From a paper:
Ferritin is the main iron storage protein in most living organisms, playing a key role in iron homeostasis and detoxification. Canonical ferritin is composed of 24 subunits, which self-assemble into a quasi-spherical nanocage with an outer diameter of ~12 nm and an interior diameter of ~8 nm. Ferritin has prominent octahedral 4-3-2 symmetry, and each ferritin molecule contains 24 C3–C4 interfaces, 12 C2 interfaces, 8 C3 interfaces, and 6 C4 interfaces, which provide several potential pathways for metal ions and small organic molecules to diffuse into its inner cavity. Thereafter, we introduced a self-assembling strategy by designing π–π stacking interactions at the shared protein interfaces involved in two different kinds of 3D protein nanocage superlattices, which is referred to as key protein interface redesign (KPIR).
As a further example of the general use of our design strategy, another AfFer mutant named P156FAfFer, where Pro156 was mutated into Phe156, was produced, which can also assemble into both BCT and SC superlattices. Differently, two adjacent P156FAfFer molecules are perfectly aligned along the C4 rotation axes in the SC crystals. It is worth noting that the contact forces between adjacent protein molecules should only be composed of π–π attraction of Phe–Phe, as revealed by X-ray crystallography. Additionally, in their SC crystals, the C4 rotation axes of adjacent P156HAfFer cages are not aligned perfectly, while the P156FAfFer molecules are perfectly aligned. We believe that such a difference in protein assembly between P156FAfFer and P156HAfFer is most likely derived from the stronger π–π interactions of Phe–Phe pairs as compared to their analogues. Thus, if only adjusting the pH and NaCl concentration in the solution, P156HAfFer forms two kinds of assemblies, while P156FAfFer only forms SC assemblies.
Author numbering:
A (entry chain H), B (entry chain H), C (entry chain J), D (entry chain J), E (entry chain C), F (entry chain C), ...: 3 to 169
């Protein structure tokens, strides 16, 4: 019996967060191959979102590794399909991604407000060390990608930011 | 308009196969972290299934890349959760995996019997080149893993095949 | 006598395909040196289409190598001049190449449907291995090039996609 | 005078934790040289527990380094002898270490709950950074070791997990 | 149970094809050491056919690997002795090898025609990938050998082609 | 809009803390060039404080980066001149630096106490990771410098500690 | 307008020479793969004519590059098929080659005599630099090839000069 100072409501939030980080992985993967369809054809975005889809997958496994470390149990659920089939312009996908990370961001803090509420000190710093700080930077990198894609404008500017920056 | 000699029923089978190869990726990922829970604690199996979950993910992207190459359109659906939460013994997971690959195997041939039926010659050899031959070997490697795990027996034999072979 | 299971009508479709792949190599060479004339002045397209003219010449030699391998005999015909002397904008030349590849694609499939009808199993896999999949990638890349040249537009965009992508 | 926001009760819990980490380093050293006696003869456990005794001695020096850093003063007490002279089978020693780590874990958390109560923000993150997560991994690995030593059994299995894993 | 979509009649043709490729490794072996007899003394042909005898042995093992991979059961029969104890001149042996490869070629296509009739798609491409194309090249090279051995003539030319080309 | 869980009062404390770390980079700069004046002539202290002046400048940029990362808005005020034009002896400067670091230390904890009161979890660990622990080490090293500068005494010892330790 | 001192008859004489070299490259290609057919099977001649086929293609692109450098316009006509389908013996192909190079030679001197009548001083030296001297060396090499092939005679001699010289 290795479980020590691990509430069962903190355990259910880890399962909820795992399914969430997998949902992001499955939306980015839609974005990535949306930019691969011949009617879009933005290769840099295809690479950029394909790494991002692989990185949100990393999030879920980390939370699955943590769940096993503390003594809980991984309870998986369905990964719902993304909320669109086409993602519009390059700006429109990045705007969609920002609101996704902001959703995951709030869910992570609520998970941290829950751990601090059950006095789960190790879970708090495990949330700080791996997620809280990484999430702000991703939002900031996204928020800086939107402002740039607005600047360059449609067309040649939309292509140039795909090759040079995301590629 | 790049679409040439690509039936729309061959297109729906690619979508069905993509969701399938993602279902396998999400079952292996359950197996992988099932073997990571402290009540199981078989590290070699955790690595072995974590690569396998990453490899079935490769299957889906390949079929998503193909879908975009021929001119179709990727229509994603929910990835259903695996059919168990605990996977029993190391033999029991490998037996479960074999019946999974055999399920994907039959679905791939049916997809190839469909393409040959619509005279889709390039899709047939794209199924031959990447999936048909790779699927038999995985089944054979699994069928050879079961027979070995039956030989070594429970306990020390179950651990030894985890470290030496899968690890 | 090396000829075995090589129908005589399968042998005529090979010579037809040889004269076809030489017509494409000779069309791209017109495109390549059209983009070299001082009134066009797009070097990346000149390089891009000069390698493609060499590559379709590779297609024909492969088909001539095969004809001799199966015991047939090569029968050359005239290489008709291209359908145009000037090829318009950079988008217009890529749209003509796409229209040309899709014709060669249909004739290869027709040649493959001809091989399977005569039970020429070895000829079928030879067309699978060297052309059918290579030809789908050729169409997908072209259709992606057109999508981008449409995005960047005329003027600076036509020069931009000429230097960075095609060259 | 360097002492700032360092409560005097936070200072006593540090000395208590120092004497605690020295008691663990001295218990593992008993275990390490128990597994070196000719009647046990398990070298991989001897090496494994001799590095752990050095590592808990590292814990205490970290806590002594911290005490001096915050302006406190180190007050040493006696290092009580371990609760046993012999430690039974290989599984029995790993189960005692687990029972020992979980005690040290509770005292670290108690020490952390003591730091947060006195608004000692820097002491809280110092306990987060060096111990809390390192201590969850120590418990998870031990509980995984017990699961395996149970699987392999006695006799050959107790020797096997001693040579390949612990050594 | 790994067997899936592997007809029992397709399994018989593999056992048959194994005994055939073994018959070809034993004929080339006879040819390889006929040219080593002091009354013949063509070392280049002794090297050439010995590699051929080792390569048709490879064929039998590839088919035996496939038989095990598809879940079947390898059934061996007698390897009949070659049809000649002496093989005449260098042209006469290469002409004999050409008639041998063409017999194996017809039995492979009949095996492939048997695989295609039972809908065994994987077996078909497996025969395509490893045999149908390799066999036509082996025949084409033997027919060219016969054409070149007829050009140089008997005597000196029969020695020259042995040293320079076969060796 | 990237701002999330970033109270407006927490934003004011960052602007304040930026102006503070700028005040510390401008005081150490005064100290660094006081020790360069010919009537002082302590080069090791001129090197030591110049690195300190560059390092507190780093602090201000880290806080300005964080202000932009969290979506806030950097507001700059005057950087007030230091409290002295001459800094006395080497002990007197290190004693002055210790009182400076302790002022910054208290304002950081008050900033952290402000971040904790608004539930700003990310800001708290961001202050933990980059400041709270770095600040206690800076203070501990200054107090040890004062203790060592008191041991060696004025004159020769005041020169020895400058060359060997600070330089 | 870059055109300067470039007559319009010299321009039509460059377009005629382009179609001539292209007819020469398409004849050598017929010769090369004629020597690849199994009833001929002369590998050294296949390689030799494939380089000469590729070499005469280079003549055509040099002239097209020249046509573009002088301000003109490339006008392409049909490349007529070679005058034979089978080329006889290796002596017979080199004799036909020599006659073809002598024809291109006179057409180049006629084009140099056409440029010298229009006072086109740069077109003269451009023909001298790239063609006139290369062509005489090509004619001297073919006539040298014809004298040797007659020396070695038919049969074994025709093979040896194929392997050793043309290979």
């Amino acid at each position: 019996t290795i479980r020590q100072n691990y509430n069962e409501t903190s355990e259910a939030g880890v399962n909820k967060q795992i399914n969430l980080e997998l949902y992001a992985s499955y939306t980015y993967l839609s974005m990535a191959f949306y930019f691969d369809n011949t009617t879009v054809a933005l290769p840099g975005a295809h690479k950029y979102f394909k790494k991002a889809s692989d990185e949100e997958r990393e999030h879920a496994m980390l939370l699955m590794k943590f769940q096993n470390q503390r003594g809980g149990t991984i309870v998986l659920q369905d990964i719902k399909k993304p909320e669109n089939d086409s993602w519009g312009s390059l700006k429109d996908a990045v705007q969609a991604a920002l609101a996704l990370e902001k959703h995951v961001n709030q869910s992570l803090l609520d998970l941290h407000k829950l751990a601090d509420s059950k006095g789960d000190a190790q879970m708090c710093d495990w949330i700080e060390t791996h997620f809280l700080t990484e999430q702000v930077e991703a939002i900031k990198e996204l928020g800086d990608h939107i402002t740039q894609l607005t600047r360059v404008g449609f067309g040649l500017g939309e292509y140039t930011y795909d090759k040079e920056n995301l590629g």
